[PDB]
Amino acid sequence: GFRKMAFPSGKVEGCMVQVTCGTTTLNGLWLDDTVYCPRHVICTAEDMLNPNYEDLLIRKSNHSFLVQAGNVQLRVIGHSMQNCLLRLKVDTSNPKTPKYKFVRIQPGQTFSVLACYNGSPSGVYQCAMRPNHTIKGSFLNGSCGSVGFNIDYDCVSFCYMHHMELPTGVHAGTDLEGKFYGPFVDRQTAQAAGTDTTITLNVLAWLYAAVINGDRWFLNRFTTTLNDFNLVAMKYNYEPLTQDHVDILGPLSAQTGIAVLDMCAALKELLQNGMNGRTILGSTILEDEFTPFDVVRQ
Amino acid sequence: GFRKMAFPSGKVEGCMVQVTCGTTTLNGLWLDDTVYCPRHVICTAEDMLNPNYEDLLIRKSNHSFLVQAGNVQLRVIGHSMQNCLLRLKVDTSNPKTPKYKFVRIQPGQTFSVLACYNGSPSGVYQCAMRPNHTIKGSFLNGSCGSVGFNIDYDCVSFCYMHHMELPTGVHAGTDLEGKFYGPFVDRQTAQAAGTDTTITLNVLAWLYAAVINGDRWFLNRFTTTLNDFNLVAMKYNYEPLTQDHVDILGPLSAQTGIAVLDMCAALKELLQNGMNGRTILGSTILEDEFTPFDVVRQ
Ligand SMILES: *C(=O)[C@H](C[C@@H]1CCNC1=O)NC(=O)[C@H](CC1CCCCC1)NC(=O)c1cc2ccccc2[nH]1
Ligand SMILES: *C(=O)[C@H](C[C@@H]1CCNC1=O)NC(=O)[C@H](CC1CCCCC1)NC(=O)c1cc2ccccc2[nH]1
């Protein structure tokens, strides 16, 4: 019993609306009296190739934004641009607005995605900010505006809004202040991400998750130094391990009875010799989208 | 970009309550003026070994049942037993009751679980009813009463309520009629699931999914027949394929140009050679909890 778990999405579902400009429809996030959505909703198919969003936005009126909260249409009474987001002010304040915050997540961190289509939520899943600032989502046509988020107590931390799919099929988007994660831009032009790496801190947390659930076959008696581990990390495209990373793994190290560098020796062996057809926590690949916090939560 | 997604949990979240009998706490489902919960909440540590539930129930006052919807205490007006659930009538009908149906899911179908503890939802994940009528869930102490469900438009089809974990780590529970899935009983005795078979329909879907999202390396220029396949499938403890199942695969076959029976001949291939390292779509063991109705719906 260990698997990717998403946060319950009820507090986010109530915030999802539909936003339409001409023949373009996508999802918006409705908090108090503001609707956030990707600004490229104002793009026609031709403007997408190289838009000037300031020009495009100045030529629109509040009336050109159709905002639907289910059956109720909301009237846009104002609007502005923040980076790659639109902020549409509406006459109604969302009564389902939860306690929330806008946060910018760091690479390797996880969040829940509420995938949405025409303003109605359709699925919820967990994923991670990749070290190269993409996310490996499952976004289809019409999912722009879907948000990523974490829940702490009763507060929703919004961290991602979806904008686009790169040619490799991974995804790119912004935080809720509209700044893109990574080097990308909202222009329909082929864009590459940097070469990705494996989130070592997450792999190790998942190795602890396995031990906690009785999967010990990969352990061994050996240990290793930080510097000696990093040398193998570099060879196999893993993020180097920091002393703060080791400090993060403290609680897991203590509950299991396995020193962090002992788990690193075990991981070094898995990288060098593979896994010999065996599985860890049901997986045959070293999973790197579970954070240490994720592990202790479950 | 191929992953398990759960349905958005909001409509179920607003139905979760906490139910306490003396020193045993678990979750309940609050629809209108009924709360549903497993009947084993009325066991004490000494009763779990061989409970006489009609005996234990008659000895319970309505006041013995501490039901709480968040901050509010709900007052139990009456109670009856339906199979292995209690139906607690309460004074107030829950205003967040959605449109809902009670359904009995079949082996191989999937549903989302809302893992709950103390009446408060903690996480949502996807899983499948195994052919041996267990589920491979992630349930901790206090999870009983959590529900599994699917959502059709705006209607919540509840299909599972959690009761117990078997010695092998898998999980057993009931439909919302209180009829257990499988031959399990709510007594803390030595029960075991029968040998679990592989959901062939879903392995075939995953093989198609490989072809759809790029991964095409395993097919062959050969083709089998339905009985010849089902015969091999049984020797390896794979479910035989049904008449209905070949039809369910229709859309995947057409979109891929690989006849169902050709993929069946591939499966008897990938069956007897091993993936020699090369992963399918993210894993190099065969995934059987991904439906055709997931491969297409993604
Ligand atoms: C918004 O709903 C979609 C989400 C895409 C759709 C498919 N999978 C996704 O993640 N967003 C888009 O289609 C954009 C279009 C651009 C508008 C102008 C500014 C930049 C984004 N994103 C794309 O990534 C896209 C569409 C597209 C069509 C044909 C060839 C390549 C291509 N890339
Ligand atoms: C309710 O919350 C729990 C859910 C369990 C807890 C751990 N993981 C789960 O899914 N339900 C139980 O604990 C049951 C108690 C009822 C069983 C039916 C009749 C009496 C009450 N107990 C078990 O599920 C259980 C105990 C046990 C002991 C040794 C091996 C396996 C085993 N399973």
XYZ file of C-alpha atoms in Angstrom, chain A residues 1-11 13 114-115 121-128 136-138 140 169 171 279 282-285 287 289 297-298, chain B residues 1-11 13 114-115 121-128 136-140 169 171 279 282-285 289 297-298:
74
model
C 0.000 0.000 0.000
C 2.046 2.934 -1.321
C 1.151 4.943 -4.401
C 0.830 8.431 -5.833
C -1.964 10.195 -3.953
C -3.449 13.549 -4.912
C -4.872 16.024 -2.435
C -8.672 16.061 -2.208
C -9.645 18.630 -4.794
C -12.958 19.946 -3.486
C -11.582 23.300 -2.385
C -13.063 22.523 -7.878
C -6.864 19.300 -11.141
C -7.253 18.800 -14.863
C -12.939 19.489 -13.427
C -12.339 16.056 -14.959
C -9.454 14.343 -13.125
C -6.928 14.851 -10.381
C -3.388 13.524 -10.227
C -0.034 14.075 -8.578
C 3.119 15.158 -10.361
C 6.344 17.053 -9.876
C 5.035 15.478 -17.145
C 1.319 16.072 -17.119
C -1.619 14.595 -18.952
C -5.433 17.506 -23.514
C 4.898 15.984 -24.960
C 4.122 20.565 -20.318
C 10.509 -4.539 -8.293
C 5.637 -2.470 -7.332
C 7.754 -0.345 -9.672
C 10.584 -1.543 -11.896
C 11.994 1.969 -12.256
C 10.549 6.597 -8.887
C 8.145 12.110 -8.010
C 2.245 11.969 4.807
C 1.249 8.500 3.504
C 2.110 11.450 -20.415
C 0.170 8.325 -19.385
C -0.830 8.094 -15.727
C -3.557 7.006 -13.344
C -6.017 9.835 -12.694
C -8.668 9.955 -9.973
C -12.055 11.595 -10.332
C -12.265 14.946 -8.550
C -13.233 14.207 -4.984
C -15.278 17.267 -4.011
C -18.762 15.747 -4.303
C -15.728 15.084 0.377
C -11.004 8.995 -1.128
C -8.732 7.935 1.712
C -10.450 13.307 3.580
C -6.688 12.940 3.221
C -6.080 11.852 -0.362
C -7.581 10.570 -3.566
C -6.206 7.766 -5.719
C -7.254 5.354 -8.434
C -7.544 1.594 -8.209
C -9.216 -1.459 -9.659
C -4.666 -3.052 -3.854
C -5.365 0.034 -1.803
C -3.349 2.282 0.494
C -5.333 2.177 3.743
C -4.016 2.900 7.231
C -1.669 -6.486 2.258
C -7.972 -4.808 0.935
C 10.084 -0.362 -20.623
C 6.992 3.872 -17.972
C 7.278 0.349 -16.602
C 8.832 -2.906 -17.754
C 6.348 -5.223 -16.095
C -4.979 -1.448 -13.807
C -9.992 8.944 -22.351
C -6.418 10.280 -22.281
